[PDB]
Design a protein around this nucleic acid. Structure first.
Ligand code: VA7
Ligand code: MG
Ligand code: NA
Ligand code: NA
Ligand code: NA
Length: 327
DNA sequence: CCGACTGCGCATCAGC
DNA sequence: GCTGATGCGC
DNA sequence: GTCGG
C-alpha cells in the first residue's frame, strides 16, 4: 500500500469504474472495478503480470488481460477510445454536477446539452437539486480544511443545543476518521424521544434554526429523518467569502446510535467490505441494526447492542479505530 | 450455465 | 388524488 | 466483472 506502487493500474481501473457507472449505467461492473482497484492498491508488491494480479480476490480474467495490455503498452485502447469520444466524455463530465446522475447526463447530452454553459442556458430543464449543484459546481469539488470543519462543528453543535439540550449531534464521515480535510459535513443527530415511540418534527426544527442563523443556505432534500443541503461559514472583515459546503444531517433512533455512527463514519468502501463479509458470516449490518441470517435470509429481531463496537466482533473482526476505516 | 453482488431515504417519474 | 418505481447520493 | 451455486 504505497500509492505509486500500482497507481497506474488502479488509475485505469478507477477510470473504468467511472465509465461503467456514468455511461453504461452498469452499477455492478462499477462496483467490481472499484473492488479490484482497492484490493490491488493494498497489495504489497508491484504487479508485473495480469496473472499475478489474477491471484487477488476480485481480479478476474478480463481485468487480468487489461493489466497485461496496460503493462505492455502504457495505455488501454478501450480507455483512450472512450476518452476521445465526445458523447461518452460529455456524459461523464455532466455527472460531476450534484443531482445530474448518469440517466440525466445522457438525456442532457442526447438533446445537445454538453457543458456547464449549455446547462446555464437551459435551467428550465433542471430540477431543484441540479440548479444548486450547477450553482455551486466549483465549490462542491473543493476540500474542507479540518479547521473549517471544526468551525462548522461549533455552529452545528451550538445551534443544535439552542433548540433542545438532549439532542446529541456527532460529525462523522472522514472528519471523525481524523482526516485533515473532508469533502462535506456529515452530522448524526439523536434525540431521546426517537426510538420506537415517535413527535417527528425533531429534524425540521433543527434545520430551521441553522437556517435562521444563516449557516444552512439551500435545501436539496428534507424529510422526516434526513436532510441534505448547503451551508456556509460566516465571514468577517473584507474577507474572501468561504465556499458553500455540502451538509447532510441524519436523525437516527437513539436506541440505534451505534449502528448509525458506524455507518456514517464509515468510510463508504469500508462499509461495503464490512457488510459484505458480515454476509459471509451470516449477519447483515445497516445504519440501524445488526441481524443474523437464520436458516436462510431471516432477521425478525435484532439485539440492541450496547457497545461502541460488538457490531464489530459479532463478525469476528479486530476493532478498527475510525482512523483505520478509510480502507 | 446462472444469479448475487452493501445498504437505504428522499425527489421525482409512472401509472391508476 | 393516491400508490409504487426509479434516479440519485449517501 | 467476479465469484460461487
Ligand atoms: N454507498 C454507501 N454504502 C454505505 N455507506 C455509505 C455509502 N456512501 C456513503 N456512506 C457512508 C459512509 C460515508 O463515510 C458517510 C458519509 O458519506 P461521504 O460521501 O461524505 O463519505 P466520506 O467518508 O465523508 C468522504 Cl471520504 Cl467522501 P469525504 O466527503 O469526507 O471526503 O456516509
Ligand atoms: Mg464527509
Ligand atoms: Na482469487
Ligand atoms: Na451527479
Ligand atoms: Na455526505
Amino acid at each position: 500500500p504505497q500509492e505509486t506502487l500500482n497507481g497506474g493500474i488502479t488509475d485505469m481501473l478507477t477510470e473504468l469504474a467511472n465509465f461503467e457507472k456514468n455511461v453504461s449505467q452498469a452499477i455492478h461492473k462499477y462496483n467490481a472495478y472499484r473492488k479490484a482497484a482497492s484490493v490491488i492498491a493494498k497489495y504489497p508488491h508491484k504487479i508485473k503480470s495480469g496473472a499475478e494480479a489474477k491471484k487477488l480476490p476480485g481480479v478476474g480474467t478480463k481485468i487480468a488481460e487489461k493489466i497485461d495490455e496496460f503493462l505492455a503498452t502504457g495505455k488501454l485502447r478501450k480507455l483512450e477510445k472512450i476518452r476521445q469520444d465526445d458523447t461518452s466524455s460529455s456524459i461523464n463530465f455532466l455527472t460531476r454536477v450534484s443531482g445530474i446522475g448518469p440517466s440525466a447526463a445522457r438525456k442532457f447530452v442526447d438533446e445537445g446539452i454538453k457543458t456547464l454553459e449549455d446547462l446555464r442556458k437551459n435551467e428550465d430543464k433542471l430540477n431543484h437539486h441540479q440548479r444548486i449543484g450547477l450553482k455551486y459546481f466549483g465549490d462542491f469539488e473543493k476540500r474542507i480544511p479540518r479547521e473549517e470543519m471544526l468551525q462548522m462543528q461549533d455552529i452545528v453543535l451550538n445551534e443544535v443545543k439552542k433548540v433542545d439540550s438532549e439532542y446529541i449531534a456527532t460529525v462523522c464521515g472522514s472528519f471523525r476518521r481524523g482526516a485533515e480535510s473532508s469533502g462535506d459535513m456529515d452530522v448524526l443527530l439523536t434525540h431521546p424521544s426517537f426510538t420506537s415511540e415517535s413527535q417527528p418534527k425533531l429534524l425540521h426544527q433543527v434545520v430551521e434554526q441553522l437556517q435562521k442563523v444563516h449557516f444552512i443556505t439551500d435545501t436539496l432534500s428534507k424529510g422526516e429523518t434526513k436532510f441534505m443541503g448547503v451551508c456556509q461559514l460566516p465571514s468577517k472583515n473584507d474577507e474572501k467569502e468561504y465556499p458553500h459546503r455540502r451538509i447532510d444531517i441524519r436523525l437516527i433512533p437513539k436506541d440505534q446510535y451505534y449502528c448509525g455512527v458506524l455507518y456514517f463514519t464509515g468510510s463508504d468502501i469500508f462499509n461495503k467490505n464490512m457488510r459484505a463479509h458480515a454476509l459471509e458470516k451470516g449477519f447483515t449490518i445497516n445504519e440501524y441494526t445488526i441481524r443474523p441470517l437464520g436458516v436462510t435470509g431471516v432477521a425478525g429481531e435484532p439485539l440492541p447492542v450496547d457497545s461502541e463496537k460488538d457490531i464489530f466482533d459479532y463478525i469476528q473482526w479486530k476493532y478498527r479505530e475510525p482512523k483505520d476505516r478509510s480502507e
